[PDB]
Ligand binder design. Sequence first.
Ligand SMILES: [Mg+2]
Ligand SMILES: [Zn+2]
Ligand SMILES: [Zn+2]
Lengths: 50, 1358, 49
Amino acid sequence: TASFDIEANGKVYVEKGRRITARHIRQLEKDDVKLIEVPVEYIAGKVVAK
Amino acid sequence: EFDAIKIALASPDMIRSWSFGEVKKPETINYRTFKPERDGLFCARIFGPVKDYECLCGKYKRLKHRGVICEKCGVEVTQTKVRRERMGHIELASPTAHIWFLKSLPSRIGLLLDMPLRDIERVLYFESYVVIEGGMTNLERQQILTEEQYLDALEEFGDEFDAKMGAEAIQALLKSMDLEQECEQLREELNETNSETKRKKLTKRIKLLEAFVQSGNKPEWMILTVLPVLPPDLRPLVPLDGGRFATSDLNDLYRRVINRNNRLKRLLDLAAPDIIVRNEKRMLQEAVDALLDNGRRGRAITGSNKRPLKSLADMIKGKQGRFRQNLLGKRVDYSGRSVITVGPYLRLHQCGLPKKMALELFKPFIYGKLELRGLATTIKAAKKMVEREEAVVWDILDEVIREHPVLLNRAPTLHRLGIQAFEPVLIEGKAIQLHPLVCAAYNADFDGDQMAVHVPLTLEAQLEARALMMSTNNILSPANGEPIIVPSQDVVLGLYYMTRDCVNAKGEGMVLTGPKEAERLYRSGLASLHARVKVRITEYEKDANGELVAKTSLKDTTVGRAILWMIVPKGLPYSIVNQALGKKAISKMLNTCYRILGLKPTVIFADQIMYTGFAYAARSGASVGIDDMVIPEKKHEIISEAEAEVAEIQEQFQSGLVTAGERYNKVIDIWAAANDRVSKAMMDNLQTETVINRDGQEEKQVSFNSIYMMADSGARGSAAQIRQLAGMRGLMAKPDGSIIETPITANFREGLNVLQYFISTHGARKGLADTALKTANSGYLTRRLVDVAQDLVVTEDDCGTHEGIMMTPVIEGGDVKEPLRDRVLGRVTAEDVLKPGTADILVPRNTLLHEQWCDLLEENSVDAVKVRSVVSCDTDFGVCAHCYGRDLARGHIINKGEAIGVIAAQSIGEPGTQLTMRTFHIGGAASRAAAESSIQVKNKGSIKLSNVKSVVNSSGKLVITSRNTELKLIDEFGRTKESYKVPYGAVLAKGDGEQVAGGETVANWDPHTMPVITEVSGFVRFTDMIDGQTITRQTDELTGLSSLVVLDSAERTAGGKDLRPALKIVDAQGNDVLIPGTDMPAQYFLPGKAIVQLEDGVQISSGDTLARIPQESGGTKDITGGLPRVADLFEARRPKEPAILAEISGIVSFGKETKGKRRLVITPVDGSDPYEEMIPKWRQLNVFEGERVERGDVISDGPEAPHDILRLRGVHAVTRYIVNEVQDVYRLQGVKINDKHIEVIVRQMLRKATIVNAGSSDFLEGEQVEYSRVKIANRELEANGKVGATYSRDLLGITKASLATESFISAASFQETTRVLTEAAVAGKRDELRGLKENVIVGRLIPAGTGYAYHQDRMRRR
Amino acid sequence: DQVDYMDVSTQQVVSVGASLIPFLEHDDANRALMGANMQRQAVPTLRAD
RNA sequence: GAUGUGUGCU
DNA sequence: TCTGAATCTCTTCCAGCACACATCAGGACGC
DNA sequence: GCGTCCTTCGGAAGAGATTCAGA
Ligand SMILES: [Mg+2]
Ligand SMILES: [Zn+2]
Ligand SMILES: [Zn+2]
């Protein structure tokens, strides 16, 4: 489940609260995008490697 | 001689009093001329002489020097028998800890000083110091100091302060303890502190301190200072073949202990460095530990072959200890053993001994009579004459063997009938001939089993074997009123083939004047044994007061039944043989013969049935061929239909309609249905397909196929074995209890494939590995059942009360499984029973209702009899005769002074073991029913739906929304006749009040996956269900529908365990809906494996399904897998989800909201209201905020726990629940057990009773004491002006209640010998030798049967 | 068309001891285990037959 | 006397 | 921060009788 | 031929000791 508004290159791909169905992954592969925005609050559930 | 046994601690002064010398050297026999060493474990100076009346060095030789002690070696010349009576002792250089008071858990040292076990074991095994006499510093009296901390304490406080370490420190701690000051301080703390856990710990320590201060014991004796040694004769070093000796365990342990002690003493004499002597003290402590109780420490030492050797505790505790191996059972002289053969020419009071066994058995008797007649002169001459087996010895053997009964005994003696007494008949050979009429009771098949004989020596033993244990007087099993001498497997076949008719014969329509001419016809062959003639018989009747009145009639019978009537005793009605006599028919015939005539006619008639069954079975030639099992011509159509339906099930589960477990539950369903259809079709085709002409056209008769004869007569067989011989073998089960998904489709008459045989191997191994590896946990049940009921014996003629359980005939889902007659028979009623001729009594208040009374109760259609139960009796240390009933083995009231606890425990405990060594007889078949999912009522009448919460469905028909419902069908009279259990979420085509016609369907449902349903319709919002965290959601992309499965508490995320899935109902505006009756929202909780095929906010109708949960109803349901339930009930295990009850009556309402979970307060209208309860949110509440609830009503749903039901609904309700559940479990396998035994066990459950308030008694507040003591004290106080003490019955399991028995010897002999012996030594208990096992161990007349009068005389003499 | 292996003979399932029972495919395996054991425990007679 | 293995009946 | 409920950890138990065979008993090192 | 000596591996349940949480 997307904890925030999934978007890339400005346009929004998956709305907030909506699950990422396989068509979304396929379309994101087709668009060929890697860099996305994210609120800093989502970093709270992350652990540093080194 | 003595009347008590006292157990307590041993003082060093007392051990030295036991001590006769001081052993200080580990020198056994010197590997030379076999003399004991000077100061070793074996020595004549310390313990006693080796040879009888002889000195060690050889200064005295005969009795004329008895008493003097020699000079050269200092030994006494006395008996050599005293080597097993005169103990030595060891003077240890350093003290050591006795482990039984250290590691009992509860550790006595641990809770005596309130310091944990770990600190004490670290101190006693030299890892840390401990503080004694803290004094003028900050160190407490029990502080633990490590090595560095102790060094710091000495460098800063090296004053008169002391801090010891090891066993000496613990001895100082215990010696410097004041019991009275600690006791009063703990009493003050108990009075002050309000917490419950510290209260329990404090009261436990107070109990221990009270046990110390009451007896003469003292805390410092629990640390060993002197170590007594076992006498040498009880640890013998037998001289083997050669120069080596036996590797006796105790000798090696004593050698090691003496080594450590002597080395420690030598080091202490030489002033060794402190670390070395500390290590050697550790070695001494661990050596003494290994000697006392080996294996309780971390590692158990071994001497050779790396095998844990036994200490002084392994031979007192366990299966190989003295209590179970050499005290409760011993090897016995005057015994024999041989393989048994039939010899059917015998009688019930006769057995067959080999001619050579009787000469070795009755050898002293032969010696005595040879000396009496003067044929011999001395004992050795008679011995030589017997060994030479002279002709005179054979003549005189027939004299001693005449009327001296012996004890025939089998190896597994499951029940009371395992030992029966027969007179011997001397025959040649080497085999023990056995009368086949008792082989069913013995369970002694003739396939190579060994029985054991025993010779009653004394006069009383012979008379007991003649009057009590004789097989003639043992024709009624103690389990039930059915006879135990049932003909079987040849006699049943012979009688059934004789007492049968077919329409043709050599002579058919002829007339005879009696049985004699029928015999003349059959012997001459002028009329077949299956004719249909009209003989003239003279049957007798005893309508008068014991006088037989004659009558003569002309009845239409066969030749065979006429012949059989010749042996029927004068007095039975002829309408007992005028049918096809199977096994149950002749069992009922023998039963009614016993009930009407008596014992001698019954035994004579049983022998005559034996003879006339064997003769006409030999003459019958009822063989078996390969042309007798006929294959039905429609079984393959049934397997084709079942294959089509399971192929439909394939598409059903692969699509997603049902899951893997549901598919497995439905496939077994359809295979079992097909198996049941094939069995019935084959049975019909094999029992009716025969053609015969009556001198005209063809007529149908009951078939004469041999297999049908031996499957209908019931001689040996059932539906299962023959069903597998022809048609469908069925589906078999794995050893774990699961059933194979594929049943093999073939029969043994046609053959098996190379793969179907591999599949049937699963069931074949299941049966055997189930017998041999799960009869252990069924013999354990009967062991710990005989243990818990050994001390219960009838002691009084009548307790004279009015209390008694309420007795009803049970109908639990089918027809009348057991009626009133089979249930109340042979039990004394508790009050004047009211017939439906009300305001008038039918049966008096204290009449033992026999068969005539049972018939009278059946005639007037009585459905509610108040009967006296053995659990409600009022006697002390036993039960009165009237609260039990009949002997169940004789046709009269039970005799006062009979051990019924043992016959109850054995009767309960050996259908399980017997039938669990029988599941391989049918092969390996699952034998699982078809799990019917519909209600086909048969009888005509109305419906009384009790405790039903039904709702309206979208179709309009009633749907049940309650779990404790039952649909009872009652006929037009109003008496109860039928009762079916409808399940949750079932639709009803009818209701209550309407007279339902006989032969319709009223209820339908789905067997697997019982559904949760709703009361009010509306839209459902998916609350607390996010995909992945708590629910697995799968969705098809094309259609877009969610069919999710929820997770358990197992596979769910750890963080998300606080998230609980549920479906909340909302309206079009999303507002809160309400349950009809209250204002609380419709929060329908979802359990695990709940599948939902809906969408959020969909429009539904009221009373529809919402989710499905699989049931996983899988199992063979045999007595092997299916009886842990009896163990759970008897040991009283708390169920996993106990249904909370209403502990007090009054109005019901909530108090605080969400004190973690839900809360509820019950308040009465008159009394105080301090009761609150904690309600986890798992279970919905069947009550609301505005009703009145009574004591015992279920707040929630689930299985009842056999503690709260007792504490709330009383003794009668819990005993009836236990009786009903155990009876259903046993009747599921066809066993017939009388309920009296179960009530005896339940009464043995209730012996402990915690005190509510002290009152005027001397008992403490929370102390748990015997209920008999409480009753006696209350009855004594009520005779005075005081007031009795209020109590409450507790319910501990059979193991728990047996381990806490007042006589410590029983508990010590049963289980946990260390934990019981330590408790008895600490408490200083005093056994009274009151029960049966105590007198068995001591070796007296048990106060059970014939010795009960002697025990009464011995008790009343003091 | 899908198979690629076939059993050598029917006798390969059972041991050497249990293979000596004739008509084994009609006996139940429960009475085949004991039959194999009591064939294992036989004693040689005087004139072998 | 104790361990180890095999076996019979339940 | 005290005190019940839940969990961790230690101990007990596991059918009865019988028969046959074997080994084994300190075995390592010095004399 | 004499003779004296210093491995793990069950599993069902009960109880007694810890930890948790929770108000
Ligand atoms: Mg048998
Ligand atoms: Zn002497
Ligand atoms: Zn009574």
